[PDB]
Design an enzyme around this catalytic site. Structure first.
Site, PDB file in Angstrom:
ATOM      1  N   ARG A  85       0.796  -1.239   0.000  1.00 23.50           N
ATOM      2  CA  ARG A  85       0.000   0.000   0.000  1.00 23.50           C
ATOM      3  C   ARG A  85       0.831   1.293   0.000  1.00 23.50           C
ATOM      4  O   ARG A  85       2.008   1.310   0.375  1.00 23.50           O
ATOM      5  CB  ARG A  85      -0.912   0.035   1.247  1.00 23.50           C
ATOM      6  CG  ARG A  85      -0.213   0.618   2.512  1.00 23.50           C
ATOM      7  CD  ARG A  85      -0.860   0.284   3.865  1.00 23.50           C
ATOM      8  NE  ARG A  85      -2.105   1.026   4.045  1.00 23.50           N
ATOM      9  CZ  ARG A  85      -2.506   1.630   5.163  1.00 23.50           C
ATOM     10  NH1 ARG A  85      -1.784   1.593   6.278  1.00 23.50           N
ATOM     11  NH2 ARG A  85      -3.658   2.278   5.151  1.00 23.50           N
TER      12      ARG A  85
ATOM     13  N   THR B 167      11.509   4.343   9.037  1.00 25.18           N
ATOM     14  CA  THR B 167      11.216   3.582   7.832  1.00 25.18           C
ATOM     15  C   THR B 167      11.538   4.396   6.571  1.00 25.18           C
ATOM     16  O   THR B 167      11.078   5.536   6.407  1.00 25.18           O
ATOM     17  CB  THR B 167       9.731   3.146   7.804  1.00 25.18           C
ATOM     18  OG1 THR B 167       9.441   2.308   8.930  1.00 25.18           O
ATOM     19  CG2 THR B 167       9.436   2.260   6.586  1.00 25.18           C
TER      20      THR B 167
ATOM     21  N   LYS C  76      14.775   1.134   8.745  1.00 24.03           N
ATOM     22  CA  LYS C  76      13.967   0.011   8.287  1.00 24.03           C
ATOM     23  C   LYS C  76      13.620   0.216   6.817  1.00 24.03           C
ATOM     24  O   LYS C  76      12.808   1.063   6.492  1.00 24.03           O
ATOM     25  CB  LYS C  76      12.671  -0.084   9.117  1.00 24.03           C
ATOM     26  CG  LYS C  76      11.651  -1.134   8.602  1.00 24.03           C
ATOM     27  CD  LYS C  76      10.574  -1.461   9.650  1.00 24.03           C
ATOM     28  CE  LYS C  76       9.271  -1.902   9.006  1.00 24.03           C
ATOM     29  NZ  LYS C  76       8.476  -2.808   9.925  1.00 24.03           N
TER      30      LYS C  76
ATOM     31  N   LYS D 171      11.938  -0.625   3.344  1.00 27.10           N
ATOM     32  CA  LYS D 171      10.885  -1.342   2.634  1.00 27.10           C
ATOM     33  C   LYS D 171      11.378  -1.820   1.263  1.00 27.10           C
ATOM     34  O   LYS D 171      12.016  -1.074   0.515  1.00 27.10           O
ATOM     35  CB  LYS D 171       9.628  -0.472   2.491  1.00 27.10           C
ATOM     36  CG  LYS D 171       8.936  -0.147   3.815  1.00 27.10           C
ATOM     37  CD  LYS D 171       8.089  -1.310   4.316  1.00 27.10           C
ATOM     38  CE  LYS D 171       7.418  -1.011   5.650  1.00 27.10           C
ATOM     39  NZ  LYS D 171       6.706  -2.219   6.201  1.00 27.10           N
TER      40      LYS D 171
ATOM     41  N   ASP E 113      12.228  -5.027   5.301  1.00 26.87           N
ATOM     42  CA  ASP E 113      10.848  -5.505   5.369  1.00 26.87           C
ATOM     43  C   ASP E 113      10.316  -5.675   3.945  1.00 26.87           C
ATOM     44  O   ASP E 113      10.078  -4.697   3.222  1.00 26.87           O
ATOM     45  CB  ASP E 113       9.989  -4.509   6.140  1.00 26.87           C
ATOM     46  CG  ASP E 113       8.605  -5.020   6.432  1.00 26.87           C
ATOM     47  OD1 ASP E 113       8.188  -6.041   5.857  1.00 26.87           O
ATOM     48  OD2 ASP E 113       7.839  -4.446   7.239  1.00 26.87           O
TER      49      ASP E 113
ATOM     50  N   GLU F 246      11.930  -8.867   7.511  1.00 24.38           N
ATOM     51  CA  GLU F 246      10.552  -9.060   7.927  1.00 24.38           C
ATOM     52  C   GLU F 246       9.720  -9.716   6.835  1.00 24.38           C
ATOM     53  O   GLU F 246       9.774  -9.325   5.662  1.00 24.38           O
ATOM     54  CB  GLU F 246       9.897  -7.729   8.297  1.00 24.38           C
ATOM     55  CG  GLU F 246      10.199  -7.249   9.697  1.00 24.38           C
ATOM     56  CD  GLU F 246       9.470  -5.964  10.033  1.00 24.38           C
ATOM     57  OE1 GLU F 246       8.266  -6.047  10.346  1.00 24.38           O
ATOM     58  OE2 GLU F 246      10.095  -4.876   9.989  1.00 24.38           O
TER      59      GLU F 246
ATOM     60  N   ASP G  46       5.724 -11.362  10.511  1.00 26.37           N
ATOM     61  CA  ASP G  46       4.889 -10.191  10.797  1.00 26.37           C
ATOM     62  C   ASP G  46       3.440 -10.501  10.455  1.00 26.37           C
ATOM     63  O   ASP G  46       2.652 -10.795  11.347  1.00 26.37           O
ATOM     64  CB  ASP G  46       5.390  -8.934  10.058  1.00 26.37           C
ATOM     65  CG  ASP G  46       4.548  -7.679  10.369  1.00 26.37           C
ATOM     66  OD1 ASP G  46       3.635  -7.742  11.211  1.00 26.37           O
ATOM     67  OD2 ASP G  46       4.732  -6.578   9.821  1.00 26.37           O
TER      68      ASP G  46
ATOM     69  N   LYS H 257       2.032  -6.347  16.848  1.00 29.19           N
ATOM     70  CA  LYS H 257       1.295  -5.088  16.798  1.00 29.19           C
ATOM     71  C   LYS H 257      -0.036  -5.197  17.529  1.00 29.19           C
ATOM     72  O   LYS H 257      -0.728  -6.199  17.408  1.00 29.19           O
ATOM     73  CB  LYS H 257       1.020  -4.703  15.357  1.00 29.19           C
ATOM     74  CG  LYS H 257       2.243  -4.693  14.476  1.00 29.19           C
ATOM     75  CD  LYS H 257       1.936  -4.053  13.151  1.00 29.19           C
ATOM     76  CE  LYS H 257       3.149  -4.058  12.263  1.00 29.19           C
ATOM     77  NZ  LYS H 257       2.935  -4.857  11.056  1.00 29.19           N
TER      78      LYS H 257
ATOM     79  N   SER I 161       3.772  -0.861  14.767  1.00 33.24           N
ATOM     80  CA  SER I 161       2.471  -0.212  14.683  1.00 33.24           C
ATOM     81  C   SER I 161       2.015  -0.149  13.244  1.00 33.24           C
ATOM     82  O   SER I 161       2.809  -0.336  12.322  1.00 33.24           O
ATOM     83  CB  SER I 161       2.558   1.220  15.232  1.00 33.24           C
ATOM     84  OG  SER I 161       3.209   2.104  14.318  1.00 33.24           O
TER      85      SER I 161
ATOM     86  N   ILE J 255       0.126   2.758  10.604  1.00 36.41           N
ATOM     87  CA  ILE J 255       0.231   4.208  10.529  1.00 36.41           C
ATOM     88  C   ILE J 255      -0.735   4.746  11.570  1.00 36.41           C
ATOM     89  O   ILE J 255      -1.945   4.731  11.370  1.00 36.41           O
ATOM     90  CB  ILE J 255      -0.105   4.731   9.112  1.00 36.41           C
ATOM     91  CG1 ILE J 255       0.904   4.187   8.089  1.00 36.41           C
ATOM     92  CG2 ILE J 255      -0.133   6.258   9.097  1.00 36.41           C
ATOM     93  CD1 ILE J 255       2.370   4.457   8.445  1.00 36.41           C
TER      94      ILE J 255
ATOM     95  N   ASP K 178       9.658  -0.263  16.687  1.00 37.44           N
ATOM     96  CA  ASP K 178       9.381   0.266  15.356  1.00 37.44           C
ATOM     97  C   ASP K 178       8.238   1.279  15.479  1.00 37.44           C
ATOM     98  O   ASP K 178       7.099   1.038  15.021  1.00 37.44           O
ATOM     99  CB  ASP K 178       9.057  -0.882  14.387  1.00 37.44           C
ATOM    100  CG  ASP K 178       8.694  -0.399  12.986  1.00 37.44           C
ATOM    101  OD1 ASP K 178       9.251   0.627  12.521  1.00 37.44           O
ATOM    102  OD2 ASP K 178       7.854  -0.986  12.274  1.00 37.44           O
TER     103      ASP K 178
ATOM    104  N   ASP L 156       7.993   4.760  14.509  1.00 30.40           N
ATOM    105  CA  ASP L 156       8.275   5.954  13.709  1.00 30.40           C
ATOM    106  C   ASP L 156       7.054   6.617  13.072  1.00 30.40           C
ATOM    107  O   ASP L 156       7.160   7.711  12.530  1.00 30.40           O
ATOM    108  CB  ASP L 156       9.282   5.620  12.604  1.00 30.40           C
ATOM    109  CG  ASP L 156       8.776   4.562  11.624  1.00 30.40           C
ATOM    110  OD1 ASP L 156       7.844   3.790  11.933  1.00 30.40           O
ATOM    111  OD2 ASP L 156       9.285   4.416  10.503  1.00 30.40           O
TER     112      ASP L 156
HETATM  113 MG   LIG Z   1       6.625  -5.555   8.879  1.00 34.88          MG
END
Ligand SMILES: [Mg+2]
Ligand SMILES: [Mg+2]
Ligand SMILES: [Mg+2]
Ligand SMILES: [Mg+2]
EC number: 5.1.1.20
Lengths: 359, 359, 359, 359
Positions: free
Chosen positions: A24, A135, A160, A162, A191, A219, A244, A268, A296, A298, A321, A323
């Site tokens: 996303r 991230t 982190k 992506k 991740d 991840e 995750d 989470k 978390s 967003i 994590d 941020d």
């Molecule tokens: Mg993850």
């Protein structure tokens, strides 16, 4: 103590830069905010964002769940019987984990308020501070490397990254551009967000290891349902693999731990339906020699405050994590946890320590 | 809430009548009692008896452990950081689960006194009453049947029947003579305390099923380490099989649940090193869809009070085995839980609600 | 063809007599009605009720998933490329299976309309008629027997008995009163709706077999997540066991078939997110020698109409549970399937045969 | 619609040069052609060639089975009830899959024609074009590199390399010499056609991994009945293994997926008995998160068109092996799919789009 009112409201805070994963993109942080007032006048706080491609929860589904199902069963109940309430929150409806979690955050807030200590102290009080990553969203190698250089400049030595959104060869190009620009001192966390196939991930992870790219962990490299594939990546590399999307609940956690399909788990509150499940996941993993990281969705500083209080409490939770709140244009909450660069310090007031809406 | 002093002391109370299982016979209940004094003046209370053939802990081993190892690590520590204390208790030495447990009851007693509520409510407070069974000690078929009649008159409609000492034939004969004399309405649990080989067990359990003797469950039919054998009995009968001596720790529970070697679990504070472990076992079991019973060793009301507060706190703990204090000539504790027939009630006092020794 | 408009509304239609199972009680049938308009002016219809304790879907969550997520990716799409559409329906959001299903009903309606044949013929066309059962809700033995006698008078020789709500002994007494009252000629389907433990279910089913109660099958005797327990009951009795809440998706069906945890599968459109997933579940099951039943939630003739068309199309679907719309005070749709007592007949119109709202 | 006539004929098209695998050599492509004539005048088309060492089917056995067994069950049936027709096709005789498949092609051709759409859109219409590989036949290292160079010049960037005929040493030398002459940009698929022992296979795949020869995947490295050896190769290398002759049917796929004995599946209409079985294999694999390739035997454009209509229809089908018709000296059908270097394109006519035989 005693619950006597549960209210909700919405917030919408644009992000400075769009957050981009393989699943996303997000331009604006939306979030449902829950307030529990108790018979003492004290107020418990809570939060849940929509994550339609992760949990399936929308803002509508959450607010409905809270008012129609959870609210009638919680009004009048005491925090002296919080196990009956937790059971009610988790079994009066199936799914709806983000809703359950918003309510549990407020519940734990008032419970620790009742007991007169910060929530993280109530749950074990293992550390007073902790280091969060930042991230780097998926973009061209060039954009990701300049993002990373700026985050290092803001005080964040743990990034982190992506990956996993298109083709694997570009992912490697992304990491090399980040490394060549930031130096080999900073820790790099990958991740993939379910974007790789198992053998594909093995080959790529070895390629990164062998190029000295210094990958700390990866991840969820594969699809969430492909537990056996995840085990394959875990068993094939020297790089720690963190579950995750594979692990939402205690039941799913037990399955990952028993099969040994991963080295670490990402917990989470939205996934686990609140703190009670997060705590259960971590304890089960701690008994298997499996460390956990708390992250978390967003979310605003509220939901990160709940997460940090839980993450702060446990010895087995060794990465963080948190941020998301720094990604928003405004901080819409007063109090809670405080940042100082990468260092998140815990507050001193009983409960979450969230005074209320900011100014 | 700082810990400033750790005191131990012994008691010895006769049993009205000897307690007899397949492992041991007890004529007098001896116990180490622990008192933790906090900087508030508050005192937290704890108990651990010797069970040389069960845990291997003796009164000498327990006292040595508490004073030479646990006490140096607990003085000066506060209860706002209990995670680190609990970890120290469980890891600064191996085994010694009885001594770890005494110190944990007093620690949780203290922690709940700090927050001004009963311990059971601090751990969830699911219920405030509960029904205990009463144990029919191993004796002749006639001698056991008398005891059963007499406990039913005292208001105990659930009897736990010790077996596994002699041979199978006599065991079936004991359950017959018990059933005859007590009618088919009262619940009968069995507890072979490891005395049957797996084959022996399947045969004896099935014989009872075909005879209509109505056995609710059988505790630990085989040797504690025979895990595959525990499973064979679980899978070849239609009677629920409860792990006891095969499950001390959360790691041991995890293995039993993963292999599905049993249907239920018996949790004791002595076995699990205290409450923190007990809670971790029950939470694992719950995540696997398995209910737990909480029992004890031969303890006074103090150790039963700690176990009852833990048991009372969780939804997934549904059976209770707290008859030990009722076997004793004297009740050497003032305060604590209250008996009235088979019914145990959780008082409203903070902590465990122990005032002190009897007069 | 093309999708040019997607609209939703709601209905709310009292039940004549309350529907009761071990999971829920329902006093009034609520539902979301989806209407897809295509470029030829043709309309396709679909439905999804809330089932918060089964699917997690509420009316707000469904309506919001349709308008915010599925509608903007469906608008402008041709039924010539309906596989990309179905993939978008299933993967644009996780969960929301009732929302996915309602849209899928209207898509398949439109796709069959295009091809100029009834949906059930487009999907295989195996039978023109089918026998539905009628559900006897959980009440006292006398009420259940009276209901059963009246359902027989209205022409229903196959009754679905809801058990599993309270204690097992009362369940056997219910079946017994129904049998004594209705005679041994009628077929008796049981549905425990997750109410029994594995060992408790085995002993209870054999007790019914032994007593000659002539049980056709038992639906989901145990909790959804306990597949090994479901397997234990399947293997222990002579009576066919049908998985229901254990199997939502094709993937979950794969797991139940691989493990051989049941003799039969209950398929519902709400659970599988529509007909495409339903179709896949039946296909895998036929390949394993495992017949299916298609049921529904509490739904109007609309959703039953889509379910019946799917059900009529496939040879391996040999049982049918389409009684929900007969429970309603008002038939709020015009056209679709028709009943003559227990016999359901398919319509000859292309698509579902649903004209519109009723007179 | 109704089926009124089933006709068969034979053709024999020369191959420009020999197709060579570990299993067989093919100098000329022979095929039975099925036309089904419907009461509308529409004609559907089908093809089955003899593959004595793969399916056991010969031209006499195909024609016999179609006329003696299948035709009598098909005459007078309508496509409104295709499920029952399909079931008679698959179950009125065992084996004879190539015969089953040829009749299915004409049936599905007719079915798509009744609804006025191309078959590929009727089955889902996911894509319009697709990239076929070209197969390098087994010859000397030099001869295989020359074919490969030539095929790259004709547009084909994905090459399927036939290996497994003599011994490991030469196989490796062929891939090296192909790599040299073709560069490292082009995709390389191997197919060993059952010619390696599992140990032999692991060794050779591992040698190619370490020599950096970039092998996308390997088809059926081991004997087709050797499921456990197939799984050993799959699990001891980092190169995707694709089941081929191991998997004819849904049932066979189910087992391969259950045990994870391969990473991918090659679906062929000839092996599955047509499109109904191919569709079922693809859907099973999708449920397990495994993508499929669709291939063919040595078939003319008619059979490749039917396969390509299936393969184009489903999302989960992501590789394509439709080179056979290009190996032929003459194209003896007008209509069907069309070639454009490596690109296959789907016509716009109803059904297969096949107009008729050669001019
Ligand atoms: Mg993850
Ligand atoms: Mg025991
Ligand atoms: Mg059901
Ligand atoms: Mg092949």
């Amino acid at each position: 103590m005693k619950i006597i009112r549960i209210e909700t409201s919405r917030i919408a805070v644009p992000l400075t830069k769009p957050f981009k994963t393989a699943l996303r993109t997000v331009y604006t942080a939306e979030s449902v905010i829950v307030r529990i007032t108790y018979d003492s006048g004290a107020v418990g706080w809570g939060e849940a964002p929509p994550t339609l491609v992760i949990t399936g929860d929308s803002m509508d589904s959450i607010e409905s769940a809270i008012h129609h199902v959870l609210k009638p069963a919680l009004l009048g109940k005491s925090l002296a019987g919080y196990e009956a309430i937790l059971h009610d929150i988790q079994h009066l409806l199936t799914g709806n984990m983000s809703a359950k979690a918003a309510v549990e955050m407020a519940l734990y807030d008032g419970w620790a308020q009742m007991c007169g200590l910060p929530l993280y102290q109530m749950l074990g009080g293992y550390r007073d501070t902790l280091e969060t990553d930042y991230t780097v969203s998926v973009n061209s190698p060039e954009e990701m490397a300049a993002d990373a250089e700026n985050y290092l400049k803001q005080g964040f030595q743990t990034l982190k990254i992506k990956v996993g959104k298109d083709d694997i060869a570009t992912d490697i190009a992304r990491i090399q551009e980040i490394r060549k620009r930031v130096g080999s001192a900073v820790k790099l966390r990958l991740d993939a967000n379910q974007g790789w196939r198992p053998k594909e991930a093995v080959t790529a992870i070895r390629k990164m290891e062998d190029a000295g790219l210094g990958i700390e962990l990866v991840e969820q490299p594969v699809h969430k349902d492909d537990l056996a594939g995840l085990k394959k990546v875990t068993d094939a590399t020297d790089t720690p693999i963190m579950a995750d999307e594979s692990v939402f609940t205690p039941r799913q956690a037990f399955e990952v731990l028993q099969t040994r399909s991963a080295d670490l788990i990402n917990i989470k509150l939205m996934k686990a339906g609140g703190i009670s499940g997060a705590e259960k996941i971590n304890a089960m993993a701690e008994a298997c020699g499996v460390e956990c990281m708390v992250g978390s969705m967003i979310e605003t500083k509220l939901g990160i405050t709940a997460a940090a209080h839980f993450a702060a409490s446990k010895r087995n939770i060794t990465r963080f994590d948190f941020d998301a709140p720094l990604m928003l244009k405004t901080d819409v909450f007063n109090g809670g946890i405080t940042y100082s660069g990468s260092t998140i310090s815990m507050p001193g007031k009983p409960g979450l320590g969230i005074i209320g809406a900011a100014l």
